[PDB]
Amino acid sequence: ALETQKPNHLLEEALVAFAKKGNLGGLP
């Protein structure tokens, strides 16, 4: 969407957003 810095960061942030919350008891 706006990968001007770090490619596919739009999707990874969403992935991390879940991790830094409760990624099935992983990546706290």
Side-chain angles (χ1 to χ4, degrees):
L2 64 161
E3 323 314 299
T4 181
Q5 282 288 56
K6 179 54 182 52
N8 194 58
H9 80 302
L10 76 167
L11 294 184
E12 64 192 1
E13 175 46 52
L15 181 63
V16 182
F18 184 48
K20 58 198 175 192
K21 201 70 48 47
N23 193 184
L24 301 177
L27 285 73

